[PDB]
Design a protein around this ligand. Structure first.
Ligand SMILES: CC(=O)N[C@H]1[C@H]([C@H](O)[C@H](O)CO)O[C@@](O)(C(=O)O)C[C@@H]1O
Ligand SMILES: CC(=O)N[C@H]1[C@H]([C@H](O)[C@H](O)CO)O[C@@](O)(C(=O)O)C[C@@H]1O
Ligand SMILES: CC(=O)N[C@H]1[C@H]([C@H](O)[C@H](O)CO)O[C@@](O)(C(=O)O)C[C@@H]1O
Ligand SMILES: [Mg+2]
Ligand SMILES: [Mg+2]
Ligand SMILES: [Mg+2]
Lengths: 520, 520, 520
């Protein structure tokens, strides 16, 4: 778009419109973009430092930044989240509309103690979207820098970096270097705007419900089965302990031995740790007792891992060591902050279909019983996909990620992104933004040496994102009332999800989606 | 339909019509429906009793009953089963036609010792099908109450109950209560009839064949491979035991080491127990040595579990403890009945593609061999899905289930119902039937207290089910004759699959489907 | 409708369909009708007994009964109630569809100890609706006999009676006697059915919301007013107490004296009584301390009276003596049952606009202050309509009444029915049902004396009621989550709103409608 300097290039579109089976959200925020890296790319490495082989990395930092609207509180206000989670069985993304407008480039001059900031009306910010996914996709790794939950909050734009292959601190012949100046990008003075629109692929609805039934309780409790199972191997009503083979048919007085059609979901057990520090071991096991994976002689913790229940009935005090998502409160520090500065999610409502993360999967025969060799079973702590298995994927949270790019691989098994959300062959693309460098005054004699002297400058503008979501309506024939999410009627000093007296918005708990119920 | 009291509302459609690649079966049976629960719902619980945490349950019994035609002998006569299993490579359901007709409600009065049963011409039985699957699906759990194998046999209609979430004997906020009076239902006096028709989704043909080849015998026995494998690590023809690295190419004289393209199916080993009581351990291991799964701190035996072969070549005497389906003979009791009162199925013909259930899957390296550290392998007793795996699902039996509803989950791996059959997103729906309550004479003064005084009454009628099945024809270029199912030419006191002198039909053995063969 | 004896005359239409801004409920129940009064009308009186002049009455009992579907649990299942109360700002009735079908008349014969009940196929039940409101309207007085909450529950039909003018036990010339045989009525044998349809007049939406603001907190807290008020009458900063006239302008530091635009609602104070028996007076004041009205020298308690708040902030333990609706639990007796056998409603959420019922309205000058005569104020305990007043009508409850007929008077002020609901000029009409008398065998000689000898007989049938309700959608721009109604996630022995193990449905608490909020 073309406009004079004194002429808005867009309006503040933020709203929340529901119609039928669709909810269209639009959120507008204002962003600050600084010069990053001094308009330079810089090779970045784990060289020096001596970080453990696990942490060794090689890659690049970029002069560009990016936009990230991959969190639900980017487009769903908490009261809108409630409308979703309280009345819908599912939902998914469908289309997306993005706009960059009202961009103002400013020049900064520092003389002595005093700094002056003036408008540079001829400078340009450049935006481009990686629609062919040619750049390393850095979204979908739960990074900060996303659009803020509170529309009145101004955010800084995160800087783009990526990585490639690394052996230790060194690189390899295949490792890749990307110059974002190589792509075509739209240049904008304060009069220009920028827009694009995107359609999501077909993906399934997310499960904004819990099961009112469990896998081991699907049968009719009033009706014996016609199937029989081997019941005893030692005779009932015998004076000694004499060998026998006694068969019984399925009965309600024994749901635990009735033949069944299905298996619980896959499991990959994690250590159980109590929220009350006393019960725990007096050691520092978050690594040595970690459930981890082993890629290229390099260990990386599994978190959040295969979707499993967080604790059993009545054991609310526990949690898997790396098998739940944990959001920090606004006060929490960056490292080694106390329990009550963070919020731990509880995926307990899937215990209906999925193993508890802290427990075994089951028991397995491991020998051939005979009159001589006593039978033997062992426990299963890793259980891969078996035919018959049914499972519920890990739930999403107002604060949590929305989607992820499915890695481009020959093969993938059930590629829901492990942290929750939609796994996309072709996600929404990255939007890269950079301030055009503005050289200061060159010398009066020619010098072919790289230009290192630039007007210090930063830019600010608004950003608009419209997303149409589909809803899956609830058709439940349940008589009794369902569980619903609700603010606490009682009194307190602070409304939930609000600014305080200093003006700080705070999200008090994580809100997931599984409240309505349906049969299994 | 509308008809006078003296006017049949349907005819006895039972038959067996084959045309081309299709077989249409129709079976009509007559049913008795009683008043269940005294027209009340009743909360049902494991409260009291003290059943082990495994067996704890919470749910409801319903005044309604249901129809169940989810067994093959409901629609296939044994001689028709033979035509299927002896000449077809596969088959599947396609459509379904159901009819309720000739319904007669009767009133019962008991005075002293003598009981009188008269016709109540104004009373109504109500039927409705759960076409939106809004009710907990209780079919597909191998319950009794199905249509009888012998058309001349009159059956009682099973009562509907369901279950929801349970912690111990207590319930949880999400648990669900269903009133079947909440759905619209068709009311019928003796003149009315009821019909509906259903189409199955596309599902694959069932495998009414065995493999004439095994996974490890697919290569050409006359032709060396061009691939090489590491053959020796200790020198042949050396005076000492000197280290070496000797490579050999694939050869018929060693099929066991030839590189191959595929893996057997997944395994989840079960205990092996002999049909001859002597060889077995002198203990009662059907639980302690059980292979089980662990859901919500509650153990449930796996039966019948992942589809595996029942015994190896020449070991006919064994069987997996909970890895075969077992049908009771008509004489067998409900609990702790002898070996010869039941019939144990033998899925041995899949040993071609699938692990034997009682044995390991394979062997795995578990260390790094060096001149110092001796190499080490361990056994695999649980093997999840690996790329390359091929497998044959558990076979179906004249007496066995036909289909099951695939649980409504975010995820499922190869959802064939474990007991055999077709896993259906939208199966045939439940048909719920109930007798309308008939109040006896109220008092002459008003009383808003619930009415507890009703004419005792039961109903009887016929029921018709027409199913069109598709057949997959056998195209085999096998020269020699195939194995076929056959009654025994020789003499005996009883024809197979018949009434005896008291009039009792008996099914003498389980009949599966895998008789024809095709290459792997 | 015309149908043979063996031919249903209607189907079981019960359901719950939401579309757009409309919710259509349909509920079907089955009813027993007895012979009432022995087909006689009987004058009924307070004669004898000696009931206090307050309780004296004169009227009639009728051989007919009536239908009553004037409670919400007649057409709203609790989970449907939740959908209403959790997502709508309002709702109202629109149309109505009623049907009588499947009617079965039965004859009863008692010989010795044994009773026999047979079908009488030629007997007729007669129904008619009082569409011209010619009969005393007995609905809308909170009587029992309504359709039961649980569709599977069979109910007895209440008997019709009415009343007219009474002086003591005696009657007056104007008192009115009604013969329901005087109206035309539809006669039905077991083959006939009966239907009618009704449209509600336009009435306002009910307020299924609470105010997020109060009348005294509508101003901007950051901005002084331009209005001034007389602040002091005794000089600040004077050594003595010298008379002055000091004026101050409206300020946030004094919301209590700022000029305002509105008045709270009307009040008619009631006695405050604590739910904890200790704090209360040691006397029996429910009459002597009752707030009552005085009509024709006859006292009648006001209950529930003008709509007022039930307790103030933090005084949850109190309630107005006759100014709240109280539902009995199923266990409660008819008279003098304990506190925990009943459920007391809490209309506290209207304290935003309306006086607290237990407190004064305000204070009023009652003299002329001078330097000699000290100023004086008194309290207001009855406050009639004043210009400026705004108020919220008493809320409705799942168990509570739906509508009432507005009395046919020259005058009415804001005629919302005091117990909650819709006040209707022309409500849904009464449906009167009676069994036609069946004379037994007359003598063989003529006798003109009234026939007193009839076959004892009662009737049963189903009844269908379809109501279309309009919804007022919630458009709230509230950021934080609203309060919502919810079943308790935690464990317990009983699901809410269910049958127990004996089969008894129980409604555990009263559920009102005010959960969403809007500004005042
Ligand atoms: C319902 C149930 O769990 N049954 C199990 C029983 C019970 O422990 C006893 O019947 C206790 O009364 O023990 C077995 O060893 C048996 O005796 O057959 C295995 C079987 O699985
Ligand atoms: C066909 C076959 O199984 N070959 C195996 C042989 C045989 O046991 C010997 O050749 C016995 O003659 O043993 C090996 O250790 C070897 O010597 O290479 C491994 C190899 O897999
Ligand atoms: C905000 C408020 O309630 N102001 C009131 C004050 C306060 O009680 C004193 O200012 C206490 O500091 O008392 C008055 O008599 C006055 O002095 O004018 C009346 C006035 O309504
Ligand atoms: Mg709008
Ligand atoms: Mg034929
Ligand atoms: Mg519907």
């Amino acid at each position: 778009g073309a406009d004079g300097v004194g002429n808005a290039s867009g309006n503040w579109h933020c709203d929340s419109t529901w119609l039928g089976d669709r909810v269209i959200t639009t959120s507008t925020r204002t962003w600050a973009l600084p010069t990053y890296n001094n308009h330079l790319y810089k090779q970045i490495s784990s060289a020096s430092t001596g970080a453990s082989n696990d942490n060794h990395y090689f890659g690049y930092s970029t002069p560009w930044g990016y936009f990230d609207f991959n969190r639900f509180h980017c487009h769903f206000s908490p009261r809108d989240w409630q409308r979703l989670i309280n009345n819908n069985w599912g939902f998914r993304p469908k289309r997306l509309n993005f706009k960059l407008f009202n961009i103002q480039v400013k020049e900064v001059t520092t003389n002595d103690g005093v700094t002056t900031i003036a408008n540079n009306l001829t400078s340009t910010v450049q935006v481009f979207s990686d629609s062919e996914y040619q750049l390393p996709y850095v979204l979908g790794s739960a990074h900060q820098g996303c659009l803020p939950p509170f529309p009145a909050d101004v955010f800084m734009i995160p800087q783009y970096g990526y990585l490639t292959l690394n052996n230790g601190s060194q690189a390899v012949g295949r490792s890749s270097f990307y110059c974002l100046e190589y792509f075509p990008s739209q240049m904008l003075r304060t009069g220009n705007n920028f827009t694009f629109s995107y359609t999501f692929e077909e993906v399934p609805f997310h499960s904004s419900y819990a099961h009112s039934q469990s896998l081991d309780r699907l049968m009719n409790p009033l009706i014996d089965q016609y199937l029989y199972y081997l019941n005893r191997t030692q005779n009932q009503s015998g004076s000694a302990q004499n060998k026998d083979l006694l068969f019984s048919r399925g009965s309600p007085a024994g749901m635990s031995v009735q033949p069944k059609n299905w298996l619980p979901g896959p499991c990959y057990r994690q250590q159980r740790v109590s929220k009350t520090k006393t019960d725990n071991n007096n050691s520092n096991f978050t690594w040595t007792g970690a459930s981890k994976y082993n890629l290229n002689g390099r260990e990386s913790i599994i978190n959040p891992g295969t979707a499993m229940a967080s604790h059993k009935d009545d054991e609310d005090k526990f949690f898997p060591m790396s098998g739940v998502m944990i959001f920090g409160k606004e006060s929490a520090g960056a490292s080694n902050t106390a329990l009550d500065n963070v919020m731990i999610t509880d995926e307990e409502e899937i215990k209906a279909t999925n193993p508890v993360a802290t427990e075994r999967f089951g028991t397995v025969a491991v020998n051939f019983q005979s009159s001589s060799t006593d039978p033997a079973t062992g426990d299963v702590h890793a259980m891969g996909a078996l035919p018959g298995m049914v499972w519920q994927d890990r739930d999403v949270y107002l604060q949590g990620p929305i989607w992820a790019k499915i890695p481009h691989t020959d093969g993938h098994f059930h590629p829901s992104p492990l942290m929750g959300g939609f796994g996309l062959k072709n996600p929404p693309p990255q939007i890269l933004i950079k301030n055009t460098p503005v050289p200061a005054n060159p010398p009066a004699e020619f010098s072919a040496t790289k230009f290192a002297s630039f007007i210090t400058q930063y830019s600010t503008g608004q950003v608009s994102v419209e997303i149409e979501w589909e809803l899956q309506k609830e058709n439940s024939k349940r008589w009794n009332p369902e569980v619903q999410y609700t603010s606490n009627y009682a009194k307190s000093a602070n409304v939930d999800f609000t600014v305080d007296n200093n003006g700080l918005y705070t999200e008090p708990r994580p809100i997931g989606t599984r409240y309505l119920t349906r049969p299994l």
